[model samples]
Target chain A: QFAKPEDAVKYRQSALTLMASHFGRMTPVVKGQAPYDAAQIKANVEVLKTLSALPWAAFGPGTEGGDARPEIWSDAASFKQKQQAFQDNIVKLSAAADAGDLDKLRAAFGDVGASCKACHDAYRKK
Target chain B: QFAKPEDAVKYRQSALTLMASHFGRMTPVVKGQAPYDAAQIKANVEVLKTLSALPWAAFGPGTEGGDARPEIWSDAASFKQKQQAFQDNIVKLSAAADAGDLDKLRAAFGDVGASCKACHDAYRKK
Candidate 1:
């Protein structure tokens, strides 16, 4: 169905970029890069709440063709397990936002970012 | 982080367009427009199966800023239910493709399309 494998790979990249865009929005404000706005956190959480299932979902079989590496498919099981940790952090990040406490948000945000840290280290392109 | 809700909106569009890109390749072949290629179906299903979780997740609170209508948030329950139906159909579509039966694929694709049809009827832009 795909014209080729990289098509799916590009799809994965777009999804990742989008997730990163949302994550980017939340982190700076929470980190004091900008003054915090509850609206920003809440809006970002609205997007984050949907975050758990992506990235990995975008990494289907042949996605290794583009910015993806075969290591993603080759090292499949650990990758998926890591995705669950990513999912958990998203839920945690969302909940942390509701509490309106800056410190908790930063810590939770770090956790969410860390969940992606390992995979991007092991699997993503330079 | 995203500069605005609409920035998130552009991000969400890229993701969905990416998702649609993969699904588009598969459905036509699955419907007999091209000779059935198990690999193509498999590749796209990798994308479609992932497609199930996306749209609703993107529609969280303020995402109604673009072409999206308030019905997305206002009728959240139905929107979610429809998304589940969409998800189930993608899973079914994936299963049917694996089974290597064309008729079954058509029916499943129809179900998936119907899921979107109803939601588009109620919530999306014209």
Candidate 2:
């Protein structure tokens, strides 16, 4: 557990920031602006999956702040569902990475991105 | 690859910050300040392994900044060797985590921390 509320805020932000970097790096390949390197993408996705499960634990009660909206604590079930949705898409994305299929990767990436957006919209303050 | 030097800086820093959080969190358990839950420690170590391989790529040529010293580029061989040493310790740490032995975990954690400090002292700016 975090030693303080501030520590929890810092920990969750660090996790989310790292997750954003990993998830955003694949944008070029998904958009066809960059060449698809199967092994590289697969490796990156593996890292992304590890990150996908990190931030939620830092969202514990009294650890509120940062971009997190009150809904995260007030509507815990809904927040948990959103987290599950994001992770489900990550699983699909991982499968696509393992298969080394560009089309599937693109589709899976979109779903995962959408999942991220939904959570941010509902749980992150402007 | 990063589209800008700033992007690279941000990416590597994000990775390093997240790595620090993951690595530092284990200190309490290692020092007997907290009870060790073998499963929790193992899960965390798995995430640390994924992170251990990320920051180096973002330290590519023309991507300088952050706390990275110029020697990272000028003395690439030494910097790379330092990276190898850190990762080798991570391998040992992972094994200790898998074994669920507190004594082994404590020793492995100290070695990994030393590896981190050695690299930071040599390659990171003050």
Candidate 3:
């Protein structure tokens, strides 16, 4: 998780590339245009879950990321709660995606986005 | 369109209070637990639309809001585009809410949030 700033930049670039590719595959599942295969959906779900967690770890105290403000460390408990909520929402989302239930997926997706917004609203500069 | 700083602050406080109350009402519709009434939904939609548009005006150049960065006025074309996008999405959202179509409302709500994200991503500090 610890990397030089240059290495962190490269790693983020790679992670973004992978994320974009994953989104390409996941779009069909989101649109309900294709069947949700449990294996593939779970794979992407794990990837997203990992991606989401990695940022928080990297952005915490004494990390290479400057975009993350010091308030994240100062407000540690709230920070952890937001991160946990994101992970929990991902679990629900992954389950819905694997099940191919549109209604569940919709709700889970909203929950996931809400979790993102909750964290950003409190912790992020914007 | 212009107000003193104190007045702008008061206006924002009022707007936020109203917005929060409106969200309290809107949540049930999002949950699909409440029956959508066309008249009431339309009234709320119009309120949201107006509320959404007001801040941009107050936050623009020569306005009393100190929180709004100067770039919003400097980049006129992009600012207008983003504002128009928000307005257009709100129109669609209003229609969907008025019609009481769950699916359409969901899609429009997503689009509305996306428009908000797009503008904030470009113009606001994070």
Candidate 4:
């Protein structure tokens, strides 16, 4: 759907930026710094669920740059695996959010964070 | 959920930026500049549906800036109406996408564009 390489770059960056914003906001709740309002957390997690699947499509051939490391294109298989891992964690996180259990949410949230870091360290630029 | 005004600004802007990306991509299809892939359009519209509900929450009190004009806070009711209008059109857009009818999708898409412009003209900065 992108008209140019830069368009894809912008699209992916926008999606990733939003994913970070949504994911980071939950940190306070996970750390017990903010109140664990189950309903609110559940709603926010729903948004995160939709966002989790977005940015990958924008990483198509020739669309490289931003914070994306060359490893994303060079080591495609591993990059895809990390993306899959992130989505799997999001699925569990969604279930935890639905159950309204802070403990479960925290664990699932940590897994997602790890998944993000795994991909970032390997595929994203500093 | 915002930690501060800037957090809110960034959150809302991220949402709006993605909204623009997802919505703008369909323009070529609507204008016959690209092939209308029904399933792809449906998937994109689904993302847009999620984004359509996001930015409003970040526009809550004490959170402003970015491209947002002061009228968003000063004329809250009208701004809300605009938000509602965008969402209502999104619902119709979703239906159109589901229906897989190009004409209907185009019409609904036009309504959404108008809704976005209506709010931007009033509540967003130049």
TM-scores for all predictions: 0.54, 0.94, 0.42, 0.94
Best by TM-score: 2
Off by over 4 Å in 4: none
Worst 10 residues of 4 chain B by lDDT: B8-17
Better of 1 and 3 by lDDT: 1
Residue ranges of candidate 3 with Cα displaced over 4 Å: A1-126, B1-6, B9-17, B20-25, B33-35
- Candidate 2 lDDT, A1-126, residue by residue in tens: 688998889878877878888899899999999899999999889889998998999999899888889889999999999999999999999999999999999999999999999998999998
The runs of at least 3 residues in candidate 2 whose Cα sits more than 4 Å from the true structure, single-residue gaps closed, are none
DockQ for every prediction shown: 0.34, 0.65, 0.01, 0.72
Local accuracy of candidate 4 as per-residue lDDT tens digits, A1-126: 777888888878778878998899899899999899999999999999999999999999999878889889989998999999999999999999999999999999999999999988888888
Question: For residues B1-126, could you state the per-residue lDDT of candidate 2 as single tens digits?
Answer: 677998889888877877888899899999999999999999989989988888899999998788899999999999999999999999999999999999999999999999999999998888
The sequence of per-residue lDDT tens digits that candidate 3 reaches over residues B1-126 is: 223555444444444443434434566676688876767777767657655654554454455443444577788898889989988998898889878787888788778778877887887656
Could you arrange the candidates by TM-score from highest to lowest? 2, 4, 1, 3
Docking class of 2: medium
Ranking by DockQ: 4, 2, 1, 3
Largest lDDT belongs to which candidate? 2
Docking class of 4: medium
lDDT of 1 by residue, A1-126 (tens): 345766666766677776786786666677698887776687667655654455565577655666665777877887777777788888888788888778888999998888788777877678
**Candidate number with the higher lDDT (2 or 4):** 2
